[PDB]
Structure formats: structure tokens, C-alpha cells
Amino acid sequence: VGAXAXVXWXWXWXWX
Amino acid sequence: VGAXAXVXWXWXWXWX
Numbered sequence: 001v002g003a004x005a006x007v008x009w010x011w012x013w014x015w016x
Numbered sequence: 017v018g019a020x021a022x023v024x025w026x027w028x029w030x031w032x
Contacts, residue, residue, distance in 0.1 A: 002026065004018015 005011035021027040 002018055002020015002022065002024075004020070004022075004024060006018065006020075006022055008018075008020060010018065 002008045003010055003016075007013045009016040018024045019026055019032075023029045025032040
């Protein structure tokens with residue numbers, strides 16, 4: 001969970 | 017991978 005790649009913001013899931 | 021919780025920086029693994 002956070003900023004980068006995964007869940008949160010950037011790549012993967014949620015936002016960015 | 018990134019900033020927050022997981023691999024990278026903050027909580028979990030690597031740094032922070």
C-alpha cells in the first residue's frame with residue numbers, strides 16, 4: 001500500500 | 017514496490 005507500484009497511487013490498483 | 021508499506025521505503029522491507 002502506497003506510492004509506486006501495488007495498491008494506492010502510480011501503477012497497479014486504485015489511482016495514478 | 018515503492019514508498020509506504022511493502023518493499024522499498026517506510027514499513028515492511030528494504031528501507032525507512
